[PDB]
Amino acid sequence: VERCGVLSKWTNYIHGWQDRWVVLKNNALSYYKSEDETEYGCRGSICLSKAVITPHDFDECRFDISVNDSVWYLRAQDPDHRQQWIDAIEQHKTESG
């Protein structure tokens, strides 16, 4: 149960939200600049074993993925698209555990 697609990711205090290519596979999330640069090293990844996926109450597009102090901030394009990503990550995590 893998998935990939564009998502808006909070990067750093200069750039903030930027569109990035996210991939759910191998009990982890990995993100790249775009789909074209998948075969060019990952820019960042996070294991889902002990991860918590929290949707934002006021930002209906935003959902956060935290493994201890390490946190990813992601925005889909609407609440419908967010829920699909949230459910995929939970199903993938459970089927991997």
């Binding site: 909070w10 750093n12 205090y13 930027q18 960042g44 930002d59 935003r62 946190v71």
Partner: protein, 234 residues
């Protein structure tokens, strides 16, 4: 370009490589845990002498790693939060971010008084990518200097101290500018002190279990108060 540059590079590199590692786990002993502050202690013996490496972690809201390291390094504000130093002065200015300090510590009766001679350097570790956070570091390690030779009034201690700070930023509400409610400073503090004398361990360890928590709580709280209402310095 001063004569300690290579030495500084090695010390910073070693701290960036081996001090940021989360808890030799069980080799480190948690002695104090208060909120986000955790103080770990290890009891090592090498070269005919027993030492006690200190390592602590802390998360401080509303301040950046740059701000924390600035206040930790700036001698001009030391008297506002430090409570164990009796006197000190700058022996030599090596560069805008590197100085040699001589200081005497108030005597922890009945142990002999300690002084220390160390190079203090503050440096930024640039982030290699957008995912890696910007790290600031202050390293204080002992050096020799003819202006501060050994005396018979104090016991010369040897130190290797580092405070490594990283700033975690969370997305602000909507499209607003970052505020201090969105920033968190991850502090790693390590201290390897060689007292240089023959004081009993029970007194040395109890004093360390007492003064390190007090200094971290007071120092971080001080940085919070001085930065309140001020524009963020990333």
């Amino acid at each position: 370009t001063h004569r300690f540059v290579q030495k500084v590079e090695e010390m910073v590199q070693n701290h960036m490589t081996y001090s940021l590692q989360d808890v030799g786990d069980a080799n480190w002993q948690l002695v104090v845990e208060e909120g986000e502050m955790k103080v770990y202690r290890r009891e090592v013996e090498e070269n005919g002498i027993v030492l006690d490496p200190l390592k602590a972690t802390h998360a401080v809201k509303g301040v950046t790693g740059h701000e924390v390291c600035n206040y930790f390094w700036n001698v001009d504000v030391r008297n506002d939060w430090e409570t164990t130093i009796e006197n000190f002065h700058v022996v030599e200015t090596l560069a805008d971010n590197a100085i040699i300090i001589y200081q005497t510590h108030k005597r922890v009766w009945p142990a002999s008084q300690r002084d220390v001679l160390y190079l203090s350097v503050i440096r930024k570790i640039p982030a290699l990518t957008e995912n890696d956070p910007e790290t600031w570091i202050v390293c204080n390690f002992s050096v020799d200097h003819d202006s501060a030779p050994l005396n018979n009034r104090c016991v010369r201690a040897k130190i290797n101290v580092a405070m490594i700070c990283q700033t975690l930023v969370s997305p602000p509400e909507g499209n607003q500018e970052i505020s201090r409610d969105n920033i968190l400073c991850k502090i790693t503090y390590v201290a390897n002190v060689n007292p240089g004398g023959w004081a009993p361990a029970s007194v040395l360890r109890a004093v360390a279990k007492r003064e390190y928590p007090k200094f971290l709580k007071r120092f971080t709280s001080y940085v919070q108060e001085k930065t309140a209402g001020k524009p963020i310095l990333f």
